[PDB]
Amino acid sequence: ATTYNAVVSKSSSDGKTFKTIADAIASAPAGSTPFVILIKNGVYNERLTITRNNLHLKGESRNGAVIAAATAAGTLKSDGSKWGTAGSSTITISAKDFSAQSLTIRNDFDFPANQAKSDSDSSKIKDTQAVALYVTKSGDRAYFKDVSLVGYQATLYVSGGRSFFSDCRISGTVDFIFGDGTALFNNCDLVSRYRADVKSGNVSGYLTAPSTNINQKYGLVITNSRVIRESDSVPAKSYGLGRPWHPTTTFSDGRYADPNAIGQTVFLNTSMDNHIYGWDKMSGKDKNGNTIWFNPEDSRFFEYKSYGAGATVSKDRRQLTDAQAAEYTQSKVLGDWTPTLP
């Protein structure tokens, strides 16, 4: 038995429906009782920020129910300032017990068109991160089932508490799943995209850029999933599994790369095509303003029973034992939270 508190549709022939998702969300009474919104097929050009606990979105179909907006970090606001990476997100989750089911969320920033622009073109953006979905420090217990997340650089920003992604598609290029959250992915397709702007022999992207605090047990955990190339034009050995993001952070002694953001990405029972070469390093700025490199061997980067052509086993690709693998069950990663849909 499932009932909807509000319905969103493109048609006036439907009847008692909201025209925009933002209006339906805003109509929810203040509080924390479950509020469930059905979103009928259509492309909704909207940016959403969710601040109400226990809010749930259900699309008519993943293929047909789309929430989309185009915003890069370097896109300018009215006051002439940049949106920034966090500010670029199509959907921002800043509440507890959110779920989305059977819908697509896109950042439509046209990265390839941007890169094709002439270097002297003043409209050419340098800050090319364009987030589709952002779970903030305030977000905990966010559940995404049968969802597709679309972007290029920085598609999915997972911060804060626990998020669970199931039966999902996530596409991107550079650092397309990133942040310090506990994010568990199960039965997802992680799609590495073609880079027209990258020379043969150079890196096209990185699936993950975790910034997990060293004291946090779990970061990005990918299980029973598929790491796939968007097309046959995506070269062999063009994508890294992850690189360590140490975010620029304000400390008492200045603003610099966080030394304690020692990210975790663990792949378990996941297929990988041969676009995967292994792990990689990442640079930041230190407390003195010098370039500092953070290395994968110093980070929490592990695999367990990877398969497919990209699943090579070497000293540069650390493997979990059976006993270690048992620490990455849904129960252990998510703790007392069982993700449920209304």
Ligand X SMILES: COC(=O)[C@H]1O[C@H](O[C@@H]2[C@H](O)[C@@H](O)[C@@H](O[C@@H]3[C@H](O)[C@@H](O)[C@@H](O[C@@H]4[C@H](O)[C@@H](O)[C@@H](O[C@@H]5[C@H](O)[C@@H](O)[C@@H](O[C@@H]6[C@H](O)[C@@H](O)[C@@H](O)O[C@@H]6C(=O)OC)O[C@@H]5C(=O)O)O[C@@H]4C(=O)O)O[C@@H]3C(=O)O)O[C@@H]2C(=O)OC)[C@H](O)[C@@H](O)[C@H]1O
**86: contact with ligand X by CB under 6 A:** yes
Classify residue 232 by its DSSP letter. Answer: T
Classify residue 340 by its DSSP letter. Answer: -
Q: Which stretch binds ligand X (CB under 6 A): 89-97, 248-256, 296-304, 326-334?
A: 248-256
Nearest-angstrom CA–CA distance, 341 and 334: 16
**β-pair partners for 143:** 99, 164
Sequence letter at residue 178: F
Tell me if residue 125 falls in helix, strand or coil.
coil
Q: Please, are residues 240 and 265 in contact by the beta-carbon 8 Å criterion?
A: no
**335: contact with ligand X by CB under 6 A:** no
Phi-psi region of 269 (alpha: psi -120 to 50; beta: other; left: phi over 0): left
For residue 309, give the nearest of 204, 228, 212, 205 by alpha carbon.
228
Site string for ligand X, 58-77 (x = CB under 6 A): ---------------x----
Site string for ligand X, 2-41 (x = CB under 6 A): ----------------------------------------
Indicate which single residue of 6, 125, 183, 209 sits in contact with ligand X (rule: CB under 6 A).
209
Q: Which stretch binds ligand X (CB under 6 A): 60-68, 247-255, 297-305, 318-326?
A: 247-255
Indicate which single residue of 143, 165, 178, 239 sits in contact with ligand X (rule: CB under 6 A).
178
Which is closer to ligand X, CB of 178 or CB of 267? 178
**180: contact with ligand X by CB under 6 A:** no
Restricted to residues 267-286, the positions that interact with ligand X (CB under 6 A) are 284
Classify residue 193 by its DSSP letter. Answer: P
Instruction: For the CB of residue 227, give the shortest distance to ligand X in the complex, in Å.
Output: 18
For residue 245, give the nearest of 263, 220, 269, 266 by alpha carbon.
263
Please give the distance of CA 303 from its chain centroid, rounded to a whole number. 20
Please give the distance of CA 338 from its chain centroid, rounded to a whole number. 21
Q: Tokens 């979990």, residue?
A: 320
The pair phi, psi for residue 322, each rounded to 5°, is: -55, -45
Alpha-carbon dihedral sign for residues 118, 123, 127, 133: negative
Indicate which single residue of 92, 153, 208, 271 sits in contact with ligand X (rule: CB under 6 A).
153
Indicate which single residue of 154, 220, 221, 261 sits in contact with ligand X (rule: CB under 6 A).
154
Q: Which stretch binds ligand X (CB under 6 A): 3-11, 80-88, 105-113, 219-227?
A: 80-88
**51: contact with ligand X by CB under 6 A:** no
Which is closer to ligand X, CB of 103 or CB of 257? 257
Q: Please, are residues 4 and 27 in contact by the beta-carbon 8 Å criterion?
A: no
**250: contact with ligand X by CB under 6 A:** yes
**248: contact with ligand X by CB under 6 A:** yes
Indicate which single residue of 129, 148, 208, 223 sits in contact with ligand X (rule: CB under 6 A).
129
Residues lying near ligand X in the complex (CB under 6 A) = 73, 84-86, 129, 153-154, 174-175, 178, 209, 245, 247-250, 284
